[PDB]
Amino acid sequence: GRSLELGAADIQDLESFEAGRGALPARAYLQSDAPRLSLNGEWQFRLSPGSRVAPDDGWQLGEALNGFESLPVPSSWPMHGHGAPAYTNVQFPFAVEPPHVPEANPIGDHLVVFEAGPEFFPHALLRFDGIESAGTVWLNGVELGTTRGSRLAHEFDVSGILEQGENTLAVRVAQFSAASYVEDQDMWWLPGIFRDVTLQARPAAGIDDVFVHAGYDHITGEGILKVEASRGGQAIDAVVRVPELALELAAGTEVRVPAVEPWSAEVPKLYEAAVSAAGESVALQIGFRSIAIEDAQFKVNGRRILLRGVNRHEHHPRLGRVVPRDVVEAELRLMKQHNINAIRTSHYPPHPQFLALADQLGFYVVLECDLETHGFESAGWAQNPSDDPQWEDALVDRMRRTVERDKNHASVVMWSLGNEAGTGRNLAAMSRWTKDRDPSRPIHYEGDWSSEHVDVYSRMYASQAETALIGQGIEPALNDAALDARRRAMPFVLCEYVHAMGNGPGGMSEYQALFEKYPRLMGGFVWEWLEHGITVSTADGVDHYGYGGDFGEEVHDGNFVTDGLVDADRRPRPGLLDFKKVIEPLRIDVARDWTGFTLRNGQDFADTSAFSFRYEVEADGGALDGGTVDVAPVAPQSETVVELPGSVAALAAGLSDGRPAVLTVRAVLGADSAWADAGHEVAWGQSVREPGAPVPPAPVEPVQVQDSELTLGPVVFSRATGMPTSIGGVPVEKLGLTLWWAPTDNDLGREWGGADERPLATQWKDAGLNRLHTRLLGISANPGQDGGETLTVRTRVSAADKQYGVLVDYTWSTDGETVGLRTQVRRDGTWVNRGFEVEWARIGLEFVLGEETELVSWFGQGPHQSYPDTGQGARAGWFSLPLAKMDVEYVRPQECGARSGSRSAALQLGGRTLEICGDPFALTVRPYSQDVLDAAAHRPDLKADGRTYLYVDHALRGVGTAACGPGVLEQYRLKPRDADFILTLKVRS
Amino acid sequence: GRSLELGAADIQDLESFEAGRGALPARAYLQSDAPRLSLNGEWQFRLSPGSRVAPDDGWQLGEALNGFESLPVPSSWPMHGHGAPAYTNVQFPFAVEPPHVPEANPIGDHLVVFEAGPEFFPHALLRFDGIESAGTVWLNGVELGTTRGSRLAHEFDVSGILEQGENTLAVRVAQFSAASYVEDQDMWWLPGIFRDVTLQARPAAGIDDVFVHAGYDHITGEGILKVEASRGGQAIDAVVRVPELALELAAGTEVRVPAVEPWSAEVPKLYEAAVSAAGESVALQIGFRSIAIEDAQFKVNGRRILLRGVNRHEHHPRLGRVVPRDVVEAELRLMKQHNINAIRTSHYPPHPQFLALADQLGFYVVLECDLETHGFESAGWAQNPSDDPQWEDALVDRMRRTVERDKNHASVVMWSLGNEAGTGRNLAAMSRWTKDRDPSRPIHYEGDWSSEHVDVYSRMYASQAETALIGQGIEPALNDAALDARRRAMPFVLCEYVHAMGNGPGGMSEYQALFEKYPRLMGGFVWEWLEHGITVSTADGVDHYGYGGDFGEEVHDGNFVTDGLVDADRRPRPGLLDFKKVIEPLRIDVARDWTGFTLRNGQDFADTSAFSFRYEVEADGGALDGGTVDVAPVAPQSETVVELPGSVAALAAGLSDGRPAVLTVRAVLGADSAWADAGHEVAWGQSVREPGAPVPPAPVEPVQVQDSELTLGPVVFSRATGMPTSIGGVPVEKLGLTLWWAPTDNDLGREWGGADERPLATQWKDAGLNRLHTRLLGISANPGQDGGETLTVRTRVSAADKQYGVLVDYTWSTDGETVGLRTQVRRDGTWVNRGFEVEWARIGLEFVLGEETELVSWFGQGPHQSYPDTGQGARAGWFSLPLAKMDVEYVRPQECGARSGSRSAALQLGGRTLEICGDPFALTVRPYSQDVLDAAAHRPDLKADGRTYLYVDHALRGVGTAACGPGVLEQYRLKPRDADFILTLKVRS
Ligand code: NA
């Protein structure tokens, strides 16, 4: 019979396995003197919900448009109220039946009218730098062709179609296409024409493509230069000029430059160059560097490098995949300001303007092809496009466009085939194509662990233990002896590690110590630089970030997209502050006697001449001595002992016992760089003279007994509970043991291995740790000193339905001024629940005070938070912050803000100050309870309740990285145990 | 030092392991002519949150009461706004550290002033029939003693304390005590004085206790009678008179009554009797019956009985544990009206007034002691009071009070030691005590499967398969050969089975067929008679039932307390309607040729003389023939073939082919009984002449094609989707395949055994079955007949992220009057998800119509819902219900309301009727979507949205009983498969 369905042709094109049609050959993105017109601006836009109903109403001509409205281009259209962003991690948001598309498939019709002056004749092209995911392009109603590879560029010849004067450009964009099955990156799905649209004249006798080859001979110091130039695919006559090197050579000929200063991320030397034909001139920045693998090490200019990396997606919280150039420049400077020297373009080529900035600012870049088929994994990889010969041409096209665009950039030191795309014949074909086209850059691909088609062995989230075995070259053999031998000779990179989601990441120091120890380890790229929060505004006026499921998604992955070192506005998370310190390129170990410091230069190429070395001694009152010490430049990978001025050690010699003082030595930029100002701190080291343990008060005040209350100096207790009700007039609503905290993103992750794979959060809920109850066993007053008394309150803490508990005894003493509180914790019964041992989050006290706190001051580590396996960036000192600044604005609220290693704290509660001292404790202060924090899914759910929740922890567990990869390392776990700890409390007006 | 804690003495008493102090010896509850004053009424009540702050302000004297307000007694105080009800199933709501109590422990001080006239002197007592959980009792300020065993009675001698005229009775009640650790029944925690408080005079020369022994010799027909009577524990001179039997005998002497009519649940013959001393007369109802175990069968009066049982808790949705007498009488009549002959008093003795009613109405009662320590099980039973010698006296006291109170009742045929209290020495001591005190009733206790200390082997929720092996006596041996031999010689009872929570229970017929087949099987007691809903009223005016967690509980078990055959107001759930039919005591199998019926009398004692046998033939128009047929009485366990009048078979002979007609034969009560009126239906059977398969319309209308719509007779289709948009003017908003339903309580239960223990609900969510998407493959018009056409719409249904799907083809045809719809379903790919095969809930269609439905009519099974493993009570006929009456008011909304076995349906949508016909289908109609139904936690969450959701299922899965015990039996499971089915649709005005 007769077919009656609508849209069949549009759908058949969307279901194509081929690369797009009609485009010019892939080439470099080049700075040319050829005339150009950017078509970016306000376009006209109409959205249809699917191909079947998308109108065929001749809209391409731009006459009498029915249902179009203004939209900026470039754009990701769901950022501008057209549908909604949708987030999945692995799962596809559509039925998995390639190459077919869902019926619900946003179709966005875009139209711009522009003027073409005489300079665009007779030859010109239209360039599109990215369209997600399938574009069909018409110019004055004439089909140019189609685009596939959402993050890749396409150019269309418009000679003889483009007209003098007015022209109408129309682009139909489908969100979903067969291409969406190979674009399954863990990020928002965001259709749109989201990168530049450019008219470019193509003058006769021009230059279409250029391939710079600029090697460095590290023995002789020569540059090895050849600049290819072609037109229409053929090598052409052109002149290359490099004025700084006193060179003029023909394009196409290799020459030896007697002396070049080589390019590295540390020293990003670039020589300005031009390659000219009669009709066109191309401007280039040439960095001379050669990359080799030698002795299972990845070497640049003859040296093994350490990659201090991050994975950079392109995201903006208001504009989606469109990242303004000011934001790109600012975030790169921010990375350099945090000691980052390497970037993986996870998992697609970046905006083409990225590459010049990386060459300039200095980063080793793993430039990754736009390919990911991760959602095929849950079906055993059945139908995976990576191994389906019908997709070979589409996947080789993606690799070809990736490589041709960026091949001239010194910053690019590896090509990556894609990410989490399984193994298969089309990956092998992409690698073959790349090795043949550009043998000058090693190939990377983590998805095939046998490493058959790559030149480095790459893994994601391998544990510190497996990374140590790999660094020693003693990881288990592959089955194939030939592949085993090849992989053993490769250097090893963590392309994603220390997942930075929420409170964390824990365990960074342990990987970094291995990276320093084993030359085969190249380093690692943190996952990930940024959180992909999307700003959501509420009717009152407050912004917060939204995450997966905040936009009506049927299927999504919640806050797994907010897993970065910075928020979407590039504000640092504590993890970035810690990472900067972990990867610092100099090591400064300050002598205990303050006579000097050991300085290790951990850079690969630069000496220490860029740095000014500063010292300062700080005490209670402020700075006591400081200055700058002159250091003869130290070679990369060498170290020296720098003497400090004698006045410094004399100051340390003369300090009274138990007066606290901190000597800090810092390496700062001696002069402005391209990425920071003079004075910018790169590295530091300290030596601390610790305050003496507080003297517990003499127990000279006796206990005053009333019918319902007991008084001991400035403490009033409920006689019914044994718990304080005020301390020097500050109301105490509650005091009790804590063992739990509001789970972090990591604690919500599965604990892989062994019989128990409940996330720690679930282990804790099952155990009742979040719902502890206290039974009073007794209250005794005992003899102290000179008629004074101590008061001991004996309690047992447990939870409904559990037989295990802890005995907690509080002993209060006071001389009328300060209050001594000794806490003793003893395990009672076996802490096992559901067949598994229970772990604690902490051993601590929670004081709920009945007044708000405005300010929190402390001597300890800071200014930012620190847990046992984090806080590397938190240094010793005296800190003071408004209460709200103690918090951490994670998108999903969770345990955060603890300051470990506190020696003393002071809370300002209006006119009164509550001072806490003792052996080291962790300090946290909040205006809402742990139950409020745990329940909150977004920051607007946190409401101050007029109280202060003060946490003083004798022990804390680490935070690890269990949301993705290793949980808390063995040394930072917290098994139930007996504990004893003393505090002093003093309320001052 | 000096102790300073408060409340230590009250707490030490609450933590006592002893039974209460000061009470008179346990005895029978007896109807005496001794004067009595009920103190029930408005008392004065003050609540303190714990012992430490409960005032010692001399309130016992009732003078100048500070902070008391009026409260009815008996009461469960949290039903009257004093704190809140709290529900846990197994878990204790307090830390498990017996005998200690939590600090938060509601203390309720109760006070009543009353007058004692001269008739209460010189001797009297105060009787308390239940206090939860610990009472301390003062009279005029003088301590009487304490109560333990919340559901047991205590009496205190008040001689010389009670005063002529005004007296003040004070009772301090603690919710929690050491006793709460042995009162862990799955029900609400509800402190209070929740049973009668009675002053009773004790005249000199009276009767304190009586023990009736009334056996029956089934061979001779003699009664064996001995009535013991004692005072102060000593046997006394008393006269027993039984006027109906022409007897006067001395108390204490056993006599042989030559002829007695024996008591059974079927024939509850009771002889009025009195036992008299000079000072007191006690009124008794004597049922003669003897109980024995013989040949591994439980026999009463020489016959094996079948128990058709339920577990009865005491609950009222507004008064808590106080069940008004009118409610008790009405619910027992309701049980008898549903063929129930047996009751287990789960898990404590009932109100003492229960027992006379069970004797009278006729039920075999398992009278269970107030003991349950289930929350010790999760710690391996460590510290279980059942095996701790410190608790022996408290537990033997509980068994002694249980047995002494009820020992005179013929209805009591087993004593049960308690429930889910593990194994141990104190259970053995309770059993020893009981066997010695009353060897006339077998002992029951399920918790020790070795059955060492009991006389019947009892299990809860054993599968139909294990029950079959037990019925054949071939279950696996115990390790001990001596215990094995004893247990093999016991008859077997399911003390809980076919858990009745939500939609269900499924699988009842299969247990009942075993009960009939194997004499060793005693029958079973459904869990449970009632839902324990608590009425919650909202500010507008609407009531709904609340469940666990609706009352602010920190820990609770949600809707596991709403798991009954009736709701808390005793309104039947569909499961009761089904159970009545499953346990019907007569079997009526109607001959296919309508000449007669086979009648089996499945009663144990009664013949069929109580019943009138009625027949009726019903067709389309109504009744065609009917009457009453005389049946000579059939003996218990015999059967006969009853001929129907010849006019009936002649009517069947003459019916036109495929005209539907139903012959129903019913056994109804011929006369009013104590529990129902004449005409009450006890049993039925049918024979159906099935309507002929509908003639599909001739496909004579062609397809009309427009740009955006196709028309085929009265059907309009979207041309873009292929789906109908109206049928004869009724708007169709949506039509598509269904495979899922909103999970029942059972589907939320774990699927025990094998590698997969996800509840089915979780299996379905994981599989994406609740979020199906449909892709259109094509639409063709094909040649029908005489220029008409059929329209085939080909689609594929699957879910985001899944590779499996089903191909669904719709073929529409019409002659302009009726519409033929053929649906073809074919599996595409392997339906496995997370390593396990996916199961479907159904194979069906959902029509979302854009108008409301007022009425639903059908020919099929009803009136109530039916699924493949339920609906036994739904008979063949013609039904018609207002839309809201199609629904089932489960407390947690869930899949329900499907009418399986429908042959035709008619929906009234204002002025139009939509008629559906075909091969048998299940029919459901709702005013809200499945997503709304699934999300709803309570009935007020269901909101009509102005649409009709119509479900027509070609297949359904069973509902089973997986919330507790067996899931869906193999024969009712639904594995993905190909299907084909035809419907006809007709819209009439
Ligand atoms: Na992520």
Ligand code: NA
């Ligand atoms: Na229950």
